[PDB]
Design a protein around this motif. Structure first.
Motif, PDB file in Angstrom:
ATOM      1  N   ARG A  91      43.655 -34.665  34.905  1.00 19.83           N
ATOM      2  CA  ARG A  91      44.524 -33.496  34.987  1.00 19.83           C
ATOM      3  C   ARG A  91      45.725 -33.631  34.062  1.00 19.83           C
ATOM      4  O   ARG A  91      46.153 -32.648  33.446  1.00 19.83           O
ATOM      5  CB  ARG A  91      44.976 -33.280  36.430  1.00 19.83           C
ATOM      6  CG  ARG A  91      43.872 -32.799  37.351  1.00 19.83           C
ATOM      7  CD  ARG A  91      44.355 -31.676  38.244  1.00 19.83           C
ATOM      8  NE  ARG A  91      45.511 -32.073  39.036  1.00 19.83           N
ATOM      9  CZ  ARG A  91      46.428 -31.231  39.494  1.00 19.83           C
ATOM     10  NH1 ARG A  91      46.353 -29.932  39.255  1.00 19.83           N
ATOM     11  NH2 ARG A  91      47.444 -31.705  40.209  1.00 19.83           N
ATOM     12  N   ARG A  92      46.290 -34.837  33.954  1.00 20.05           N
ATOM     13  CA  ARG A  92      47.439 -35.030  33.078  1.00 20.05           C
ATOM     14  C   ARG A  92      47.046 -34.899  31.610  1.00 20.05           C
ATOM     15  O   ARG A  92      47.803 -34.341  30.809  1.00 20.05           O
ATOM     16  CB  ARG A  92      48.076 -36.391  33.349  1.00 20.05           C
ATOM     17  CG  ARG A  92      49.277 -36.704  32.480  1.00 20.05           C
ATOM     18  CD  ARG A  92      50.257 -37.599  33.218  1.00 20.05           C
ATOM     19  NE  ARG A  92      49.569 -38.630  33.985  1.00 20.05           N
ATOM     20  CZ  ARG A  92      50.171 -39.665  34.556  1.00 20.05           C
ATOM     21  NH1 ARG A  92      51.478 -39.840  34.467  1.00 20.05           N
ATOM     22  NH2 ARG A  92      49.441 -40.547  35.234  1.00 20.05           N
ATOM     23  N   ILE A  93      45.867 -35.404  31.242  1.00 23.89           N
ATOM     24  CA  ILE A  93      45.414 -35.300  29.858  1.00 23.89           C
ATOM     25  C   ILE A  93      45.066 -33.856  29.515  1.00 23.89           C
ATOM     26  O   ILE A  93      45.391 -33.368  28.427  1.00 23.89           O
ATOM     27  CB  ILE A  93      44.228 -36.252  29.616  1.00 23.89           C
ATOM     28  CG1 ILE A  93      44.717 -37.699  29.553  1.00 23.89           C
ATOM     29  CG2 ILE A  93      43.500 -35.895  28.331  1.00 23.89           C
ATOM     30  CD1 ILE A  93      43.677 -38.680  29.062  1.00 23.89           C
ATOM     31  N   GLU A  96      47.295 -29.901  32.739  1.00 24.49           N
ATOM     32  CA  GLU A  96      47.640 -29.231  33.986  1.00 24.49           C
ATOM     33  C   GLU A  96      48.844 -29.856  34.679  1.00 24.49           C
ATOM     34  O   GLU A  96      49.372 -29.257  35.621  1.00 24.49           O
ATOM     35  CB  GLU A  96      46.438 -29.235  34.930  1.00 24.49           C
ATOM     36  CG  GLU A  96      45.190 -28.601  34.337  1.00 24.49           C
ATOM     37  CD  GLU A  96      44.022 -28.596  35.301  1.00 24.49           C
ATOM     38  OE1 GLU A  96      44.238 -28.852  36.504  1.00 24.49           O
ATOM     39  OE2 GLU A  96      42.884 -28.337  34.855  1.00 24.49           O
ATOM     40  N   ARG A  97      49.284 -31.032  34.243  1.00 21.00           N
ATOM     41  CA  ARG A  97      50.450 -31.683  34.826  1.00 21.00           C
ATOM     42  C   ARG A  97      51.391 -32.195  33.740  1.00 21.00           C
ATOM     43  O   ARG A  97      52.351 -32.912  34.025  1.00 21.00           O
ATOM     44  CB  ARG A  97      50.025 -32.837  35.738  1.00 21.00           C
ATOM     45  CG  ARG A  97      49.407 -32.402  37.061  1.00 21.00           C
ATOM     46  CD  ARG A  97      50.443 -32.308  38.183  1.00 21.00           C
ATOM     47  NE  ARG A  97      51.528 -31.375  37.895  1.00 21.00           N
ATOM     48  CZ  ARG A  97      51.407 -30.054  37.874  1.00 21.00           C
ATOM     49  NH1 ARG A  97      50.257 -29.459  38.144  1.00 21.00           N
ATOM     50  NH2 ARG A  97      52.470 -29.310  37.578  1.00 21.00           N
TER      51      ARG A  97
ATOM     52  N   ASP I  69      48.409 -39.367  24.697  1.00 25.19           N
ATOM     53  CA  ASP I  69      47.244 -39.310  25.578  1.00 25.19           C
ATOM     54  C   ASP I  69      46.392 -40.569  25.454  1.00 25.19           C
ATOM     55  O   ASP I  69      45.839 -41.058  26.449  1.00 25.19           O
ATOM     56  CB  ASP I  69      46.424 -38.057  25.280  1.00 25.19           C
ATOM     57  CG  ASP I  69      47.220 -36.783  25.488  1.00 25.19           C
ATOM     58  OD1 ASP I  69      48.372 -36.874  25.961  1.00 25.19           O
ATOM     59  OD2 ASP I  69      46.696 -35.692  25.184  1.00 25.19           O
ATOM     60  N   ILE I  93      38.226 -35.333  26.648  1.00 25.30           N
ATOM     61  CA  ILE I  93      38.782 -34.696  27.839  1.00 25.30           C
ATOM     62  C   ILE I  93      39.645 -33.500  27.453  1.00 25.30           C
ATOM     63  O   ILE I  93      39.638 -32.468  28.136  1.00 25.30           O
ATOM     64  CB  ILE I  93      39.567 -35.723  28.678  1.00 25.30           C
ATOM     65  CG1 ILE I  93      38.624 -36.794  29.221  1.00 25.30           C
ATOM     66  CG2 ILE I  93      40.268 -35.047  29.841  1.00 25.30           C
ATOM     67  CD1 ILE I  93      39.336 -37.920  29.927  1.00 25.30           C
ATOM     68  N   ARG I  94      40.389 -33.609  26.348  1.00 23.93           N
ATOM     69  CA  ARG I  94      41.186 -32.481  25.875  1.00 23.93           C
ATOM     70  C   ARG I  94      40.327 -31.292  25.465  1.00 23.93           C
ATOM     71  O   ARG I  94      40.846 -30.174  25.362  1.00 23.93           O
ATOM     72  CB  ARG I  94      42.064 -32.910  24.697  1.00 23.93           C
ATOM     73  CG  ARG I  94      43.428 -33.457  25.089  1.00 23.93           C
ATOM     74  CD  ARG I  94      43.925 -34.462  24.067  1.00 23.93           C
ATOM     75  NE  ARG I  94      44.429 -33.818  22.860  1.00 23.93           N
ATOM     76  CZ  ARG I  94      45.713 -33.683  22.560  1.00 23.93           C
ATOM     77  NH1 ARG I  94      46.662 -34.143  23.359  1.00 23.93           N
ATOM     78  NH2 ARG I  94      46.055 -33.070  21.431  1.00 23.93           N
TER      79      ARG I  94
END
Lengths: 97, 93, 82, 323, 107, 110, 93, 82, 98
Positions: A91-93, A96-97, I69, I93-94
């Motif tokens: 979620r952080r990547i 969304e956070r 990231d 993931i991005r």
DNA sequence: CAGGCACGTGTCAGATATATACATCCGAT
DNA sequence: ATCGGATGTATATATCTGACACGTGCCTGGAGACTAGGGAGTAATCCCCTTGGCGGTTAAAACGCGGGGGACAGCGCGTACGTGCGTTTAAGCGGTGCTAGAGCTGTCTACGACCAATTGAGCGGCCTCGGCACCGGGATTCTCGAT
DNA sequence: ATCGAGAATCCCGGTGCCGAGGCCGCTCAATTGGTCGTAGACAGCTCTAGCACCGCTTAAACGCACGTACGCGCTGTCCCCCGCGTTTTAACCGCCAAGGGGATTACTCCCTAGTCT
């Protein structure tokens, strides 16, 4: 008694739930949850059935994508068990956070 | 070619809130770009709403709903309050 | 009767099935609360926009069109309905 | 000595008013036409005429082109335009303005013949204007105004002796002719802080003696209608004339008489004199001006001489109120 | 008052916003109240950005707003970071943030 | 006069309606004026895209031993193609499902 | 009233490509939504291009640039080729 | 002339400084090559859109406005240039 | 022989490059790279200086975000050294590559 | 259409920023 | 405890910003009642779609429990990456010169907006039979405990 | 390191079903044929700035040395999630009422436009 080894009964029904296209979440609990979330904004709101169905579809696709990213992070972490920290990282990547 | 900029208005707002400070030219351009981006976003959302509800005009409600849709909670509430105050003041006079 | 504690309606087998479709092999035990929390956050975010949409048009029923509009606003663009 | 210069400029603003619907020209062009009409010299060059500041190049170019060629190609093109000429001709009818004439020409109604043939498309005001198109455009000699003023005063005192009626305007100023009648009435029981049938009684009495022939609009404060003097059973009937009746409270009646007596230049000069003397004069009352510009309670008015004395100015007869 | 902005008590232009709304082909008719409301919203947002920047700019013994101060003000706040999460600023730099694991031994 | 009609879509040899596209472009308030060649070009682009996606969907449907296209076939055709998936990366299909994809690590090593 | 849709056009395209296949109602709705989404994206990009270039109209050039700028690679190239062929055929009358 | 190879112009210390600004301490050896590849593909993606914008305007000079429009098209809005 | 422990001279550089706003990439090599990329789409193109500066700003910000990231992924993987597979995972993931 | 005037743009004095010297003060060794 | 990088403190450039100067397109230019019509706000209906309830069945959820395989902590190592130093080499600044093309303006000219008049296409209603869902049994295939 | 028991799944066949597709009756938006104001295509002008080149100047890049510490392989502990069986339970389907809400007219009512001297 015949017992399958742990893991086989996972990949089996992984094939099933990836081959099939039903909902996988019961209609009434999701409808009640949606109504409870909605009543916090405006009291006494009505919902069309198609609206609840669209909400379920979009939410379920989002959850499937999030679980895909969580599994990817877990595999990257030298591990096969997904953990809440994997969800937090995904979620952080994703932003969304 | 006379450019169109928000420079003097941004400076007036800054003097209204921080009379003892100044602002550089690059920061002025950044503020101008930010104002243009927010205006474009709000106008686009209002046009989308007006086309959506089969209406043929943009009123204060369209802009207000756009503000409520884009800006987060506290910012949206304060912006709606300020704009409603401005609209009432303009209408009353 | 005002609704209460309906996030528990998302049962553990349902989350397990969703994760299996996602493609995980084995699932931890503390993940269900996190999944319920993120589900609640996403649903709140979508339904807030949908409710704001359905109030600008002076209406009391949330149409699937409003849900589609709210989802497209967040960058989801759900096809199918409408 | 600009008889041709003034006349050519007359219709130009009219098309701006009734066709272009731009009063922001009409007013400027009529100001220019008035200032040219009083200039006691024949114009030779537009730059000389520019000495009236406000002759921005737009009037100067037109007057130079008119002097060089004897006309204006824009004016000639707009003269031969059927739509513009039709709209201008229709607007000569009372009640027919820019929008009405534009709509009539849009549906093909362009002449008095079509206007007569389309009675159902006209309100009462437009029909009355159509009926008396020729009569309304005629000028009114002073002897006829004396006769009908005598008749009006006789009827007004017949209604009640406490009524006060004054015929204001150019006729009050002593002009030999007028285009319409502005008659001002008051009643002692009717003040600013005080009957809605006072004007109705006068209107009904004048209609009873067959002086008022038509009613255009009639309210509790002002009445719009038509009057015609009776013929002496053998002469040609007198043309119908536009008559206005306005009811004013007693504390505002003499201020209204001063306002409607004119002239406009004289009224503007009196307002400027009041302003420089620290007073504001309007159609209704006079008020003192404070040091910060705040107007106070209006002063009591019982005569025109009182108004002149308020602004420290000698009383002037209406004959001397040209400017 | 004479200018439309002065009637609404704003420093942002009602006329310019209205003209942009007309030319921008957003809708063929624009109501009278929309540009005033939009100008008020833009004024409030600009005031928020500027006051946050000043509260940031001032703290380094600097009395002139710099793009670094704008970036600090936008990133430090939560609602504004969500509003401009996908926006980069020239010469904005990065927030000072070193992960706790990256920090050295206690010793 | 009034020669026998022939729709502009038939004039351009297109199945998609260029007249409806022109009307939507005019009434969507995108620009003050709309050129005559833009609706034809846009309808041709839309027809090509629809033909491609329908061809892949029909191929997938016949692969799954069916005569009738269902949303699962559309999802399979969209995700299997590389360019179409990039075009519709941020699009979710109702009743679409997920492509079969199991990580190599999760497979039993034995 | 009347709800317009691309159902008949999508059906004709399907018959022209796969003569012996059908399509369900939900697949038809998904295809209709896809067509509307793509049309909206292309029209919005063309309008944005026209506004950027200070022009007041959208022509075949604007739509072509929008198509080249939205669709990726060979899909964009083939779409441009097909549209150019269609425009040439239409202007040939 | 014709530019043969310039992706090597993004030197190892430049990547190291960028990573330090990112917030890392230790950097592997393949990070430099991978970052060069990613930067090249991102620059290609932005430059294609910028060149398309320039060509549509019938111009031979790629201005900063084209670059900021190309960046805004991908959601990476840039401030301070227009 | 005053030698610092490995890692201290990393944080002394971290704080500096996080407290500053310099571009950190030499301008001329980046301009040459931009021209080399651009000549593959249209020959004989000329660039405004502000366009090159904006391109450098965007690329620098994008690389900084990608490295952040990557660092988060590396720390998640119980590690302090970033590896190319960390960049692969972050981009995956991005949503960028696929 | 004629005035009134808020912005746009250009210019120079100068607060504000930056860089340059030395005396304290704190993490590796 | 010593000593190279962070701190303050004073000073000397330096420089980019704010207070004037002048031009130029925007910007808004009388009022007081008296007609005449308009979007809509509310009164009044019409289906009818969603809300709610009650009961019967049962697939699914909750709960218990025995493992066994995966999460995880600790050890050892060896090689990959850090810091440092001398050297090169290419970035950076400052001129110097040149012309390709961005920006603007004048002139039309085909082009698209707009409006009667006409009619064929696509939408709504209404069958209807066949691709497909579902069930049942047989055949085939996948998985795990030992010989 | 396959045999075989046991279980899961594909295939073939049979049966019924409801909606995909086709046909008919339209309404109205697409098409034709005209006019008319104008957006911009095409030439001509500047004159700004991007490009090319050269000459210092020196700070960053680089090759190489050397230490050292961190990723990775390995090993042993243990713990907690999965497969299976048993016991609730509320999800779902069937029916009903019902009731207010989106979609209509319809009178009028303050608001807005026209006008006028």
């Amino acid at each position: 008694p015949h017992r399958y080894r742990p893991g086989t009964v996972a990949l089996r029904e992984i094939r099933r739930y990836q081959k099939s296209t039903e909902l996988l979440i019961r209609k009434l609990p999701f409808q009640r949850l949606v109504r409870e979330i909605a009543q916090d904004f405006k009291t006494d709101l009505r919902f069309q059935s198609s609206a609840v169905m669209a909400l379920q579809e979009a939410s379920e696709a989002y959850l499937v994508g999030l679980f895909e990213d969580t599994n990817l992070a877990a595999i990257h972490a030298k591990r096969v068990t997904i953990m809440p920290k994997d969800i937090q990282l995904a979620r952080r990547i994703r932003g969304e956070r | 070619s006379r450019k169109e900029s928000y420079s003097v208005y941004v400076y007036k707002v800054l003097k209204q809130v921080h009379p003892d400070t100044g602002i550089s030219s690059k920061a002025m351009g950044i503020m101008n770009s930010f104002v243009n981006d927010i205006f474009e976003r709000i106008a686009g959302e209002a046009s989308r709403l007006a086309h959506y509800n089969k209406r043929s005009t943009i009123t204060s409600r369209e802009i207000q709903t756009a503000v409520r849709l884009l800006l987060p909670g506290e910012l949206a509430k304060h912006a709606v309050s300020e704009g409603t105050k401005a609209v009432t003041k303009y209408t009353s006079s | 009767k005002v609704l209460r504690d309906n996030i528990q309606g998302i049962t553990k087998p349902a989350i397990r099935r969703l994760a299996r479709r996602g493609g995980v092999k084995r699932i931890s035990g503390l993940i269900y609360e996190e999944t319920r929390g993120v589900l609640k956050v996403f649903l709140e975010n979508v339904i807030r926009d949908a409710v704001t949409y359905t109030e600008h048009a002076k209406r009391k029923t949330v149409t699937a069109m409003d849900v589609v509009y709210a989802l497209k606003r967040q960058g989801r663009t759900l096809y199918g309905f409408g | 000595l600009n008889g041709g210069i003034t006349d050519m400029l007359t219709e130009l603003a009219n098309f701006e008013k009734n066709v272009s619907q731009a009063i922001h020209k009409y007013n400027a062009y009529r100001k220019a036409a008035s200032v040219i009409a009083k200039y006691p010299h024949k114009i030779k060059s537009g730059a000389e005429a520019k000495k009236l500041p406000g002759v921005g190049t737009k009037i100067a170019e037109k007057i130079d082109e008119f002097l060089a060629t004897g006309k204006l190609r824009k004016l000639e093109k707009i003269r031969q335009d059927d739509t513009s000429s039709s709209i201008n001709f229709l607007t000569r009818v009372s009640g027919i303005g820019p929008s009405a004439a534009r709509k009539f020409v849009d549906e093909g109604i362009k002449t008095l013949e079509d206007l007569r043939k389309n009675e159902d498309k006209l309100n009462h005001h437009q029909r009355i204007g159509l009926k008396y198109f020729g009569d309304f455009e005629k000028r009114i000699p002073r002897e006829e105004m004396l006769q009908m003023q005598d008749i009006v005063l006789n009827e007004v005192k017949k209604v009640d002796s406490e009524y006060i009626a004054t015929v204001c305007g150019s006729f009050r100023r002593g002009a030999e002719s007028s285009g319409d009648m502005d008659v001002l009435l008051t009643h002692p029981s009717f003040t600013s802080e005080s009957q809605p049938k006072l004007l109705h009684q006068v209107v009904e009495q004048l209609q009873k003696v067959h002086f008022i022939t038509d009613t255009l609009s009639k309210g509790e404060t002002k009445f719009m209608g038509v009057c015609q003097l009776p013929s002496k059973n053998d002469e040609k009937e007198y043309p119908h004339r536009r008559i206005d009746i306005r009811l004013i409270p007693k504390d505002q009646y003499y201020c209204g008489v001063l306002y409607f007596t004119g002239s406009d230049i004289f009224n503007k000069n009196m307002r400027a004199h009041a302003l420089e003397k620290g007073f504001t004069i309007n159609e209704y009352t006079i008020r003192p001006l404070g040091v910060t510009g705040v107007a106070g309670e209006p002063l009591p008015v019982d005569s025109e001489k009182d108004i002149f004395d308020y602004i420290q100015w000698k009383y002037r007869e209406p004959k001397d109120r040209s400017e | 008052a004479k200018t439309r902005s002065s009637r609404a008590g704003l420093q942002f232009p009602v006329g310019r916003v209205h003209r942009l709304l007309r030319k921008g082909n957003y809708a063929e008719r624009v109501g009278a109240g929309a540009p005033v409301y939009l100008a008020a919203v833009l004024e409030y947002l600009t005031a928020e950005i500027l006051e946050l920047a000043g509260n940031a700019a001032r703290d380094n013994k600097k009395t002139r707003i710099i793009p670094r101060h704008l970036q600090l003000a936008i990133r430090n706040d939560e609602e504004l970071n969500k509003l401009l999460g996908k926006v980069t600023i020239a010469q904005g730099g990065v927030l000072p943030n070193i992960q706790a694991v990256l920090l050295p031994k206690k010793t």
